[PDB]
Design an enzyme around this catalytic site. Sequence first.
Site, PDB file in Angstrom:
ATOM      1  N   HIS A  43      16.224  13.790  -8.848  1.00 37.82           N
ATOM      2  CA  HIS A  43      17.357  13.252  -9.144  1.00 37.82           C
ATOM      3  C   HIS A  43      16.978  11.727  -9.470  1.00 37.82           C
ATOM      4  O   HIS A  43      18.009  11.102  -9.612  1.00 37.82           O
ATOM      5  CB  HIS A  43      18.627  13.116  -7.870  1.00 37.82           C
ATOM      6  CG  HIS A  43      17.762  12.722  -6.563  1.00 37.82           C
ATOM      7  ND1 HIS A  43      17.345  13.218  -5.473  1.00 37.82           N
ATOM      8  CD2 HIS A  43      17.892  11.048  -6.177  1.00 37.82           C
ATOM      9  CE1 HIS A  43      17.017  12.380  -4.668  1.00 37.82           C
ATOM     10  NE2 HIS A  43      17.249  11.011  -5.162  1.00 37.82           N
ATOM     11  N   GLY A 148      16.002   4.751  -0.948  1.00 39.22           N
ATOM     12  CA  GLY A 148      14.705   4.557  -1.472  1.00 39.22           C
ATOM     13  C   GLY A 148      13.504   5.262  -0.799  1.00 39.22           C
ATOM     14  O   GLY A 148      12.371   5.215  -1.415  1.00 39.22           O
ATOM     15  N   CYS A 150      13.548   8.638  -0.843  1.00 40.67           N
ATOM     16  CA  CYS A 150      13.117   9.775  -1.483  1.00 40.67           C
ATOM     17  C   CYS A 150      11.927  10.248  -2.147  1.00 40.67           C
ATOM     18  O   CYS A 150      11.385   9.076  -2.753  1.00 40.67           O
ATOM     19  CB  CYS A 150      14.346  10.164  -2.340  1.00 40.67           C
ATOM     20  SG  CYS A 150      16.151  10.747  -1.523  1.00 40.67           S
TER      21      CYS A 150
END
Lengths: 306, 306
Positions: A43, A148, A150
């Site tokens: 993503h 932030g 991920c």
Amino acid sequence: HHSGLVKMSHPSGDVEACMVQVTCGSMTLNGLWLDNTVWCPRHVMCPADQLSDPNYDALLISMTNHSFSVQKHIGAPANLRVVGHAMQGTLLKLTVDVANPSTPAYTFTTVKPGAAFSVLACYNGRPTGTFTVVMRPNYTIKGSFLCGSCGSVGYTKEGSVINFCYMHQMELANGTHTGSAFDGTMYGAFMDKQVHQVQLTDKYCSVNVVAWLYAAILNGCAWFVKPNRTSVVSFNEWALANQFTEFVGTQSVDMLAVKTGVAIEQLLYAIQQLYTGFQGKQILGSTMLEDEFTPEDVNMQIMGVV
Amino acid sequence: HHSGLVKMSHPSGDVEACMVQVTCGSMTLNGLWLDNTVWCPRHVMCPADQLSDPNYDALLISMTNHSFSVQKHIGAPANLRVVGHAMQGTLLKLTVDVANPSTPAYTFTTVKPGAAFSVLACYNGRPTGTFTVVMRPNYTIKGSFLCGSCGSVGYTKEGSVINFCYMHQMELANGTHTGSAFDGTMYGAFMDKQVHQVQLTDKYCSVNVVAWLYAAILNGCAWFVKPNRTSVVSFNEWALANQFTEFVGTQSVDMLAVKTGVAIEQLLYAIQQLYTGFQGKQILGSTMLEDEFTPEDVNMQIMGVV
């Protein structure tokens, strides 16, 4: 009175040297740099307006190698040129033109419910914290992750070998967290889409409650131990009705039984009794069952055994 | 449901690169290598049969530089030649012929009761685990340390600067642990002799209980909040009669009051009532007050402040 147990993480230095920042357009998160490959959540490709129902196959088609910027900020900084990009499940596999000189010995493994692993929480390619969690029976973890995070990674260690098992993806409605294995599957039945998702029921990890009761015994706290016994098969029928995982013994549990002279079946009985309430008493400072320590945590931290 | 709080340590890589093994005769433990200095506990000089009443001043006089063997095991291994030795309080300062090429920016500081710090547990100079503790009001910590762990270090981090605050020395009767600051003082009234020592009473850390109640409010759990207030002066008289530290507010607690809309004085009142019992209710999965998370933990982990 103190058990000698803490939430123990592996030293994180080896993994720190693998973390990078990955940026695709407006989007940025963390990646893992091993050999000529950088892994990150797919993503990073997705516009903020599209996260609820993204079409990753078309997003990927629209990308080129220059769509992706990869930077190492810590240690000797580095800009990594992407020369190939691929998708595997919920992860991107970016090929870069330089092999990570600090690549550790490593494997990719999946973790199972009740098992412990170490997490290196990162933001903008910079490690900021480390903690350990148990994979819950519903394939969430009770972590600490903000926007932030991920691409932060979870791992175990066997010797010098790092076994990467988790890459962070999302937070669920109840505050718990989930992510991918490095085969690109999401743990459990989750989807990497920003939409309310059914969450399965959590359960007590039976094997880990047994480990904690053995830790209590090793600390001289044995008031809950009686001659009474519940067999594994009988306990497992009971567990299905009372929100416990089914118990499966391991040599790590057996070492605790032998060191303490208390049979597994005695603690299975105890658990059944304690689940109805502690009757004003305490075990290792707690009034409810603890399932966040593993048989291996107990063997290592208390007895020095690996 | 899950609070988003975990026991969060600093990434340990910077400190891993400073750990060495220190051996003197038949005793071995860990040391900390910074520039041309290795710090270690002075009881490395003491034969096992004399640990209960050692004469460190005479041991030190008997030693030569060649009495100490220092090895760096991890990374680029090295045998470090000792070229000077000195004692400061409960620590040795060994001068070695090589400056640590991975010396981080650092200071020495002392940590205060209620404040959290990261520990890197080491055995034979090899880092083995990392975990976080708060300094208890009785100058002990609830750690996880075995034979051979002495010389393990605790630290905080401000930016890139590592503030070393703790070097492990001993385990007490109740299973808790203590050590030295790098000025050579033992925390508390403890002495580095293998003898039973009076341990002071532990207390609840009021400011950390306040931070936890704010964490609960941040997560929708606020049934314990009322208009009722207790002033800091009144709470602190009560705290001396109920095994709590006196409350001293900080800017970090003030940030939580603003973010939640709940005054410190409302939570001081709550604490007094909760301490008599949760009336079978729960706060963030707990039936007792939690004092092992700091106002800074809550700000950083839940709100992303620094």
